[PDB]
Amino acid sequence: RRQRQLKKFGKQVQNATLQKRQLEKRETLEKIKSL
Amino acid sequence: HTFVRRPVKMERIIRPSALRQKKANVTHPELGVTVFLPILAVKKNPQSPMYTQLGVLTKGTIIEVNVYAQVTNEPDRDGCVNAVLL
Amino acid sequence: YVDRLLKDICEYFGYTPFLAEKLFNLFSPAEAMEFFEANPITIRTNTLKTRRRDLAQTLVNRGVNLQPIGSWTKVGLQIATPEYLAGHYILQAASSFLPVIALDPHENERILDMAAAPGGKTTYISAMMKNTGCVFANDANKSRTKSLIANIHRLGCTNTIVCNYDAREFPKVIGGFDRILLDAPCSGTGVIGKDQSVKVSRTEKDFIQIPHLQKQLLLSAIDSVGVIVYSTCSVAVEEDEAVIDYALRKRPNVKLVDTGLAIGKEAFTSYRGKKFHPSVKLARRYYPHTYNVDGFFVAKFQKIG
Amino acid sequence: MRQLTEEETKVVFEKLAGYIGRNISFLVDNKELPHVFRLQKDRVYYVPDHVAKLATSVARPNLMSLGICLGKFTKTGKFRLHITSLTVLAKHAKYKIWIKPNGEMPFLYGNHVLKAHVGKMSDDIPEHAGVIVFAMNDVPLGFGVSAKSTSESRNMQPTGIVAFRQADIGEYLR
RNA sequence: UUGACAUUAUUGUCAGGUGGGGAGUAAAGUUACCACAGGGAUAAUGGCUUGUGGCAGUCAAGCGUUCAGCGACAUUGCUCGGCUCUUCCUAUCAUACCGAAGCAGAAUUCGGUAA
């Protein structure tokens, strides 16, 4: 009841993680540039 | 390009010493003078916490210099570390 | 007067005149310049595991040149290897030996410490104690506590206790009736030739607060006790020969005792019709240029009451 | 922070049972200077009884170390031994090993012990029994699980591994 | 367990620190080193390629709602080698010609045609 869902969402999980990391990087860069 | 038995918990990610530079080019935005000074420590390397732990010098990294400054250039593509005092 | 000589020191060395003025009280005309001339590498042998004589030849196997340090003790040698990690010796400045020389330990007794963050003094005391009795260690810097425990484990004292709390609260914790150690609380520090930050980063607020804090540290130390030994890595009068005056005035139970050996200088005589000096002339001082050891002060007292 | 439970001492001695046989009983029966075991948030130390008695005056959050640190209990309930314990293990080392003076640096770097170093390691050492290393100085360098018996290690290619390194004095280089 | 108090040495009281041991109103998360195993999809000229850098500032063809931003060229601060016969390219060492250079002659340097 878990491995099938993990396999199905593996691509979605990777995309979400990459998007979150990129958003964090952009937020940090903007905060640095905000000064 | 990065900054440096000291390693403890790192796996086979050996970094050649050629990629290690002790000095960076520091410029003051409010002053028309620039000084070449040693790199003290990396504060926050973006794009990864592991990059901060390993001391990488990617663009945008915040560092400290022996008088905080942020690197603005890409050292991996030119071999120099240009930083602007914050 | 001819202030050009004073200007030369501030010009060449970039020293702030505010701090420089403290080193011109009826001294030699170039005393400040002489002070900056020095502004050595000494290693203390670990007698617990290996004698200095054995280390006087084992290190030579790699071509390392060593010489005895001054005349205080032969335990140290003056100029990453497995010997370093073996605990056979610890890198320690010759100045750091004087607090332990004055603080002569006795076997089976307990030693109380306040700010031995580097851990060299505690390890030397334990070596003199031959791992007997108990040695306390304290430091406000939580991060530096790893240096103390790591050094103790490497040198194998086996009788050291490390705690993190304000030294002023120490008397109410245990208050053991034994000798206590205080070292290097000064703001107007000594070895500045190594601590480059002191050239400019100094203010009157530091001399107002920090000396008035180490002043209470001495009072807390005697309360925690019973030989009392005070020391500071600075030559300024604001760090020694004046702080202990408050402790002597506020507490009669403590009496001044011989600080240490013949090495070192003493207080000055007087200034004509303008200023004088206290009765703390027994205090011993050192300079980074007159002697190999950096600027340092040592004092010893006994609690009669 | 409390005195070690009798059950915990069983596991503590079991871990010590590897590098030290039943002689470990000679580590507390001396009685010349009594010693007790104390723990501080899963970290255990070997401390004299008299010095440990007065240590209770300090609150647990402020005490960082006491006596000589031996090991620490893992979150899963197992026990691991730190390099700091190497100081005491030298007194009762049942099995010992050594490494070449020109090949000790890799050992200090965490590398395993190779057969390239040959000699007269203590006989009767089991295949996986723990061992302790010395240089020219009888100075402990570390401890780890063995990989081959005395006979197997001697009659082996120099490139073969003879002991698995798990702790060494190099931890103090940081 | 530290300090004070009183008794032919010594035993009790007080004060203070500590106190998942006991009395009454311990474990779960965290971790981008997470390491060992489980599993998801990659990774095997779009005319590519070359001689003049990086970060910082003025100088500014013109665009920024009028032009809220950007921005060429010089300028400034430190800074697996090594064998063999043949064919072919020019980004040519020599032979041929020409121009420039304090080219007195000699010799020399660069550039252009030139395989």
Coordinates of N, CA, C and O in Angstrom, one line a residue, chain C residues 83-173:
Chain C
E83 N 53.1 11.9 17.2 CA 53.5 12.3 18.5 C 52.5 13.4 19.0 O 52.1 13.3 20.2
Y84 N 52.0 14.3 18.2 CA 51.1 15.3 18.6 C 49.8 14.6 19.1 O 49.3 15.0 20.1
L85 N 49.3 13.6 18.4 CA 48.1 13.0 18.8 C 48.3 12.0 19.9 O 47.3 11.7 20.6
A86 N 49.5 11.5 20.1 CA 49.8 10.6 21.2 C 49.7 11.3 22.6 O 49.7 10.6 23.6
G87 N 49.6 12.6 22.7 CA 49.6 13.3 23.9 C 50.9 13.5 24.6 O 51.0 13.9 25.7
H88 N 52.0 13.2 23.9 CA 53.3 13.3 24.5 C 53.6 14.8 24.8 O 54.5 15.1 25.7
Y89 N 53.0 15.7 24.0 CA 53.3 17.1 24.2 C 52.1 17.9 23.6 O 51.4 17.4 22.8
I90 N 52.0 19.2 24.1 CA 50.9 20.1 23.6 C 51.5 21.4 23.3 O 52.3 21.9 24.1
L91 N 51.2 22.0 22.2 CA 51.6 23.3 21.8 C 51.1 24.3 22.8 O 49.9 24.5 22.9
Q92 N 52.0 25.0 23.5 CA 51.6 26.0 24.5 C 52.7 27.1 24.6 O 53.9 26.8 24.6
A93 N 52.2 28.3 24.6 CA 53.1 29.4 24.6 C 53.8 29.4 26.0 O 53.3 29.1 27.0
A94 N 55.1 29.9 26.0 CA 55.9 30.0 27.2 C 55.2 30.9 28.3 O 55.3 30.6 29.5
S95 N 54.4 31.9 27.8 CA 53.7 32.7 28.8 C 52.7 32.0 29.5 O 52.4 32.3 30.7
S96 N 52.0 30.9 28.9 CA 51.0 30.2 29.6 C 51.6 29.3 30.7 O 50.8 28.7 31.5
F97 N 52.9 29.1 30.8 CA 53.5 28.3 31.9 C 53.4 29.1 33.2 O 53.3 28.5 34.3
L98 N 53.6 30.4 33.2 CA 53.7 31.2 34.4 C 52.5 31.0 35.3 O 52.7 30.9 36.5
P99 N 51.3 31.0 34.8 CA 50.2 30.8 35.8 C 50.3 29.5 36.5 O 49.8 29.4 37.7
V100 N 50.8 28.4 35.9 CA 50.9 27.2 36.6 C 52.2 27.2 37.5 O 52.2 26.6 38.6
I101 N 53.2 27.9 37.1 CA 54.4 28.0 37.9 C 54.1 28.7 39.2 O 54.4 28.2 40.3
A102 N 53.3 29.8 39.2 CA 52.9 30.5 40.4 C 51.9 29.6 41.1 O 51.9 29.5 42.4
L103 N 51.0 28.9 40.4 CA 50.0 28.0 41.0 C 50.6 26.7 41.1 O 50.3 25.7 40.4
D104 N 51.5 26.5 42.1 CA 52.1 25.3 42.4 C 51.1 24.3 43.0 O 50.6 24.6 44.1
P105 N 50.9 23.1 42.4 CA 49.9 22.2 43.0 C 50.5 21.3 44.0 O 51.7 21.0 44.0
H106 N 49.6 20.7 44.9 CA 50.0 19.7 45.8 C 49.2 18.5 45.6 O 48.0 18.6 45.4
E107 N 49.8 17.3 45.7 CA 49.1 16.1 45.4 C 48.0 15.8 46.4 O 48.0 16.2 47.5
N108 N 46.9 15.2 45.8 CA 45.7 14.8 46.5 C 44.8 16.0 46.8 O 43.7 15.8 47.4
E109 N 45.1 17.2 46.4 CA 44.3 18.4 46.6 C 43.4 18.6 45.4 O 43.6 18.0 44.3
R110 N 42.5 19.5 45.5 CA 41.6 19.9 44.4 C 41.9 21.3 43.9 O 42.2 22.2 44.7
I111 N 41.8 21.4 42.6 CA 42.2 22.7 41.9 C 40.9 23.2 41.2 O 40.2 22.5 40.5
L112 N 40.6 24.5 41.5 CA 39.5 25.1 40.9 C 39.9 26.1 39.8 O 40.9 26.8 40.0
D113 N 39.3 26.1 38.6 CA 39.6 26.9 37.5 C 38.4 27.6 37.0 O 37.2 27.1 37.1
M114 N 38.6 28.8 36.4 CA 37.5 29.7 36.0 C 37.4 29.9 34.5 O 36.4 29.6 33.9
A115 N 38.5 30.2 33.9 CA 38.5 30.6 32.4 C 39.7 29.9 31.7 O 40.4 30.6 30.9
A116 N 40.0 28.7 32.0 CA 41.0 27.9 31.3 C 40.5 27.3 30.0 O 40.5 26.1 29.8
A117 N 40.0 28.1 29.1 CA 39.4 27.7 27.9 C 40.4 26.9 27.0 O 40.0 25.8 26.6
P118 N 41.6 27.3 26.8 CA 42.5 26.5 26.0 C 42.8 25.2 26.6 O 43.0 24.2 25.8
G119 N 42.8 25.0 27.9 CA 43.0 23.7 28.5 C 44.5 23.4 28.8 O 44.7 22.4 29.4
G120 N 45.4 24.2 28.3 CA 46.8 24.0 28.6 C 47.1 24.1 30.0 O 47.9 23.3 30.6
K121 N 46.6 25.1 30.7 CA 46.9 25.3 32.1 C 46.4 24.1 33.0 O 47.1 23.6 33.8
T122 N 45.2 23.7 32.7 CA 44.6 22.5 33.4 C 45.4 21.3 33.2 O 45.7 20.5 34.1
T123 N 45.8 21.0 31.9 CA 46.6 19.8 31.6 C 48.0 19.9 32.3 O 48.5 18.9 32.9
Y124 N 48.6 21.1 32.3 CA 49.9 21.2 33.0 C 49.7 21.0 34.5 O 50.5 20.3 35.2
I125 N 48.6 21.5 35.1 CA 48.4 21.3 36.5 C 48.2 19.8 36.8 O 48.7 19.3 37.8
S126 N 47.4 19.1 36.0 CA 47.2 17.7 36.2 C 48.5 16.9 36.0 O 48.8 16.0 36.8
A127 N 49.4 17.3 35.1 CA 50.7 16.7 35.0 C 51.5 16.9 36.2 O 52.1 15.9 36.7
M128 N 51.5 18.1 36.8 CA 52.1 18.3 38.0 C 51.4 17.5 39.1 O 52.1 17.1 40.1
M129 N 50.1 17.3 39.0 CA 49.4 16.5 40.0 C 49.5 15.0 39.7 O 49.0 14.2 40.6
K130 N 50.1 14.6 38.6 CA 50.2 13.2 38.3 C 48.9 12.5 38.3 O 48.7 11.4 38.8
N131 N 47.9 13.1 37.7 CA 46.5 12.6 37.6 C 45.8 12.3 38.9 O 44.8 11.6 39.0
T132 N 46.4 12.9 40.0 CA 45.8 12.7 41.3 C 44.8 13.8 41.7 O 44.8 14.9 41.0
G133 N 44.0 13.6 42.7 CA 43.1 14.6 43.1 C 42.0 14.9 42.0 O 41.7 14.1 41.2
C134 N 41.5 16.2 42.1 CA 40.5 16.6 41.2 C 40.9 18.0 40.6 O 41.4 18.9 41.4
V135 N 40.7 18.2 39.3 CA 41.0 19.5 38.7 C 39.7 20.0 38.0 O 39.1 19.2 37.1
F136 N 39.2 21.1 38.4 CA 38.0 21.7 37.8 C 38.3 22.6 36.6 O 39.4 23.1 36.5
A137 N 37.4 22.6 35.6 CA 37.6 23.4 34.4 C 36.3 24.1 34.1 O 35.2 23.5 34.2
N138 N 36.4 25.4 33.8 CA 35.2 26.2 33.5 C 35.5 27.2 32.3 O 36.6 27.6 32.1
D139 N 34.5 27.5 31.5 CA 34.6 28.4 30.4 C 33.2 28.9 29.9 O 32.3 28.0 29.7
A140 N 33.1 30.2 29.8 CA 31.8 30.7 29.3 C 31.5 30.3 27.9 O 30.3 30.2 27.5
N141 N 32.6 30.2 27.1 CA 32.4 29.8 25.7 C 32.0 28.3 25.5 O 32.9 27.4 25.7
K142 N 30.8 28.1 25.2 CA 30.3 26.7 25.1 C 31.0 26.0 23.9 O 31.4 24.8 24.1
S143 N 31.2 26.7 22.8 CA 31.9 26.0 21.7 C 33.3 25.6 22.0 O 33.7 24.5 21.6
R144 N 34.0 26.4 22.8 CA 35.4 26.0 23.1 C 35.5 24.8 24.1 O 36.6 24.3 24.3
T145 N 34.4 24.4 24.7 CA 34.4 23.3 25.6 C 34.9 22.0 24.9 O 35.5 21.2 25.5
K146 N 34.7 21.9 23.6 CA 35.2 20.7 22.8 C 36.7 20.7 22.8 O 37.3 19.6 22.9
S147 N 37.4 21.9 22.8 CA 38.8 21.9 22.9 C 39.3 21.4 24.2 O 40.3 20.7 24.3
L148 N 38.6 21.8 25.3 CA 39.0 21.3 26.6 C 38.9 19.8 26.8 O 39.9 19.1 27.2
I149 N 37.8 19.2 26.4 CA 37.6 17.8 26.6 C 38.5 17.0 25.6 O 39.1 16.0 26.0
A150 N 38.6 17.5 24.4 CA 39.5 16.8 23.5 C 41.0 16.8 23.9 O 41.7 15.8 23.9
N151 N 41.4 18.0 24.4 CA 42.8 18.0 25.0 C 43.0 17.1 26.2 O 44.0 16.4 26.3
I152 N 42.0 17.1 27.1 CA 42.1 16.3 28.3 C 42.2 14.8 27.9 O 43.0 14.0 28.4
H153 N 41.3 14.4 26.9 CA 41.3 13.0 26.5 C 42.7 12.7 25.8 O 43.2 11.6 26.0
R154 N 43.2 13.6 25.0 CA 44.4 13.3 24.3 C 45.6 13.2 25.2 O 46.4 12.3 25.1
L155 N 45.6 14.1 26.2 CA 46.7 14.0 27.2 C 46.4 13.1 28.4 O 47.3 12.9 29.2
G156 N 45.2 12.6 28.5 CA 44.9 11.6 29.5 C 45.1 12.1 31.0 O 45.7 11.4 31.8
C157 N 44.5 13.3 31.3 CA 44.6 13.7 32.7 C 43.8 12.8 33.6 O 44.3 12.4 34.7
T158 N 42.6 12.4 33.2 CA 41.7 11.5 33.9 C 41.2 12.1 35.2 O 40.4 11.4 35.9
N159 N 41.5 13.3 35.6 CA 41.1 13.9 36.8 C 40.5 15.3 36.6 O 40.6 16.2 37.5
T160 N 40.0 15.6 35.4 CA 39.5 16.9 35.0 C 38.0 16.9 34.9 O 37.4 16.0 34.3
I161 N 37.4 18.0 35.4 CA 36.0 18.2 35.3 C 35.8 19.5 34.5 O 36.4 20.5 34.8
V162 N 34.9 19.5 33.6 CA 34.6 20.6 32.7 C 33.1 21.0 32.9 O 32.2 20.1 32.8
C163 N 32.9 22.3 33.2 CA 31.5 22.8 33.4 C 31.3 24.1 32.7 O 32.3 24.8 32.4
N164 N 30.1 24.4 32.4 CA 29.7 25.6 31.6 C 28.8 26.4 32.5 O 27.6 26.1 32.6
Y165 N 29.3 27.5 33.1 CA 28.4 28.5 33.8 C 29.3 29.7 34.1 O 30.5 29.7 34.0
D166 N 28.6 30.7 34.6 CA 29.3 32.0 35.0 C 30.1 31.7 36.2 O 29.7 31.1 37.2
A167 N 31.4 32.2 36.2 CA 32.3 32.0 37.3 C 31.9 32.7 38.5 O 32.3 32.3 39.6
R168 N 31.0 33.8 38.4 CA 30.5 34.5 39.6 C 29.6 33.6 40.5 O 29.6 33.8 41.7
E169 N 28.9 32.6 39.9 CA 28.1 31.7 40.6 C 28.8 30.5 41.2 O 28.3 29.7 41.9
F170 N 30.1 30.4 40.8 CA 30.9 29.2 41.3 C 30.9 29.1 42.8 O 30.7 27.9 43.3
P171 N 31.1 30.1 43.6 CA 31.1 29.9 45.1 C 29.9 29.2 45.6 O 30.0 28.3 46.5
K172 N 28.7 29.5 45.1 CA 27.5 28.9 45.7 C 27.3 27.4 45.2 O 26.5 26.7 45.7
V173 N 28.1 27.0 44.1 CA 27.9 25.7 43.6 C 28.6 24.7 44.5 O 27.9 23.8 45.1

